[PDB]
Design a protein around this motif. Sequence first.
Motif, PDB file in Angstrom:
ATOM      1  N   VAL A 193      -2.072   2.068  -5.137  1.00 53.58           N
ATOM      2  CA  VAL A 193      -2.355   0.782  -4.506  1.00 53.58           C
ATOM      3  C   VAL A 193      -3.070   0.956  -3.172  1.00 53.58           C
TER       4      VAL A 193
ATOM      5  N   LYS B  19       0.813  -1.207   0.000  1.00 54.61           N
ATOM      6  CA  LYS B  19       0.000   0.000   0.000  1.00 54.61           C
ATOM      7  C   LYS B  19       0.851   1.263   0.000  1.00 54.61           C
TER       8      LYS B  19
ATOM      9  N   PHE C 183       2.851   1.971  -2.285  1.00 54.83           N
ATOM     10  CA  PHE C 183       2.888   2.355  -3.695  1.00 54.83           C
ATOM     11  C   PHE C 183       1.692   3.238  -4.038  1.00 54.83           C
TER      12      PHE C 183
END
Length: 291
Positions: free
Chosen positions: A219, A214, A216
């Motif tokens: 994402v 997460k 990223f």
Amino acid sequence: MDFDMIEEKKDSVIVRNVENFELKDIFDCGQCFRWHRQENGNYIGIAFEKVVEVQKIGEDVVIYNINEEEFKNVWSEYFDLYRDYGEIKKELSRDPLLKKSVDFGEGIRILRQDPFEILLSFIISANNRIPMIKKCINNISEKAGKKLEYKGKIYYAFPTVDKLHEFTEKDFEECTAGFRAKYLKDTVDRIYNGELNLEYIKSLNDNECHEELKKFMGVGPQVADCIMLFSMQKYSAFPVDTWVKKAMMSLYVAPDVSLKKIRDFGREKFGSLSGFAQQYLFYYARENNIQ
DNA sequence: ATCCAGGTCTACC
DNA sequence: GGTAGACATGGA
Ligand code: NA
């Protein structure tokens, strides 16, 4: 192991007595984007810089364009052939509410795909339709991937990290990631400069892996679960997209329950088999367009 | 047309 | 730690 043995042919490998393996179930259950159904029912796909064609005849599976060495080091694991899906289905079927979905997708297997390709593929999947997702992934590949030849046609492998780092936000927009273009560029940059390491993330336990993913841009909880499930084998993952949400509201929860609550409910109920339960539910829900 | 599709980010409380 | 609006694209 869901197969007996293999026979190496001239330009293919035959996997004998395969169980819990149906092409439509595997390639159309939503987990992959580079497999295409042929007129004859075979499927041709591009993965790990290789073009492969798969055909099912009775209890046997023919994998064209690979040899025995490749089957052992790449494809046997790609199709998750060492896992006994009969046991998975038996366990999940103990829950009457899951039975209809399991029966509908009895031949589903969770492929072991490449983390880098999956990371970008599912960032692209956010609030998007599968046909458009497939187009974008193929465009990215055509734009900077290695050329592969198979039966008269040229296919394009997914681009290397180095090649994708050359993409500008505009390049992604041209392959048409829409507003997601900036997320793809930011993500490729972080991979390229080593800020986040996929091999390291893949080694983490389910919950820690989810948290790192997460980090990223692009994402969230759902995309992170898809990534760790499809490329990192973290089976306690429970990606809740629009279809899984519908499936859960039809069987387990009320219509006003948040996605986070649905994810927690599913992971608590299905445990280490959550990812599998999710796939059967997704496939049944989407194919039957449940309302 | 308004909405939906393998949601996420931001701003806000 | 929980919620409205914005964010591209194209099909229905
Ligand atoms: Na994120």
